Curated annotation (Swiss-Prot):
The keyword Iron-sulfur does not apply. ATP binds at G31, E32, F33, G34, S35, G36, K37, T38. GO terms for molecular function: ATP binding; ATP hydrolysis activity; ATP-dependent DNA damage sensor activity; damaged DNA binding. Involved in DNA repair and in homologous recombination. Binds and assemble on single-stranded DNA to form a nucleoprotein filament. Hydrolyzes ATP in a ssDNA-dependent manner and promotes DNA strand exchange between homologous DNA molecules. GO terms for biological process: DNA recombination; DNA repair. Belongs to the eukaryotic RecA-like protein family. Coiled coil: none annotated. The keyword Magnesium does not apply. This is DNA repair and recombination protein RadA. Keywords: ATP-binding, DNA damage, DNA recombination, DNA-binding, Nucleotide-binding.
């Protein structure tokens, strides 16, 4: 299938990314507390449900939450401020809490079931979010005796995610804190604005995009 792109809500950020985040790819967004990476996740979970003319892919969402950062009320707010129906938008986000790193890996494996079910329907899964990719791995695998296993497990997890992205034409979006992935780094700008910097993209030039966080999620 042709690569599809989901608008981030920000024209500036979309331009930096070559149109939006890609299906058949993992986009990995880094940032510190309050960077906007989870706000971007919430915005994408709304945007993807729109038609292509509006920046979406007529899709469903699956969301794996590792430390309780998913906010249904924020989804409703973004949906309503974008002229959408908040209840319908929420219904098409399948949610799973991951309690630990093993569970998180299992959830990605098992997500394939719902992906298969929705595949040839009116609302195929088009966005799979893991927020965050590494919090459990960082917490569980401490020090050097644990580094080898941590990297091996994380690598396997990313491979599973890549497979779902490629096989089922899904945009995978993961958050992290400091190929395989397209890496975007968020930081605080001036006056409450946020700045995204794209780094080490094989076929997109590095660059920066300034964006805002609003009742619509993110936008220029
Ligand atoms: C949401 C995200 C991942 C999942 N795996 N299984 C069910 C499910 C729901």
């Amino acid at each position: 299938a042709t690569i599809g792109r989901i608008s981030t809500g920000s024209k500036s950020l979309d331009k930096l990314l070559g149109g939006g985040i890609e299906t058949q790819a993992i986009t990995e967004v880094f940032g510190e507390f309050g960077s906007g990476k989870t706000q971007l996740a919430h915005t994408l979970a709304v945007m993807v449900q729109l038609p292509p003319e509006e920046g979406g892919l007529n899709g469903s969402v699956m969301w794996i939450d590792t430390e309780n950062t998913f906010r249904p009320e924020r989804i409703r707010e973004i949906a309503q401020n974008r002229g959408l129906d908040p209840d319908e938008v929420l219904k098409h986000i399948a949610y799973a809490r991951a309690f630990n790193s093993n569970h998180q890996m299992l959830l990605v494996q098992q997500a394939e079931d719902m992906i298969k079910e929705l595949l040839n329907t009116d609302r195929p899964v088009k966005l799979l979010i893991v927020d965050s990719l590494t919090s459990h791995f960082r917490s569980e695998y401490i020090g050097r005796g644990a580094l080898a296993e941590r990297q091996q497990k994380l690598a396997k997890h990313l491979a599973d995610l890549h497979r779902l992205a490629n096989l089922y034409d899904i945009a995978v979006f993961v958050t992290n804190q400091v190929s395989a992935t397209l890496r975007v780094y968020l930081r605080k700008g001036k006056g409450g604005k946020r700045i995204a910097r794209l780094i080490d993209a094989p076929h997109l030039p590095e660059g920066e995009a300034v964006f805002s966080i609003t009742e619509k999620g993110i936008e220029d």
